[PDB]
Amino acid sequence: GSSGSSGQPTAQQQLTKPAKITCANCKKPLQKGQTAYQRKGSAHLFCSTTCLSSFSSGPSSG
Ligand SMILES: [Zn+2]
């Protein structure tokens, strides 16, 4: 005979949704109005190209 778990224990606490917007690279408070950069099929914004590119990590389980 034998046994198993086959369970997925999940439980975390965090803010349902953010209040303000920040760069996904430098994490800077983008003033309301300033233009933001967004990649294709992605929900991440950036302050400027310099970051948009920097963020890109590469071939890492992605
Ligand atoms: Zn940035």
Curated annotation (Swiss-Prot):
It is found in: Nucleus. It comes from the Eukaryota. Functions as a transcriptional regulator. Interacts (via N-terminal 120 amino acid region) with ETV5 (via C-terminal). This is Zinc finger MYM-type protein 5. The gene is ZMYM5. The chain holds residues 229 to 277 of 669 of the full protein.
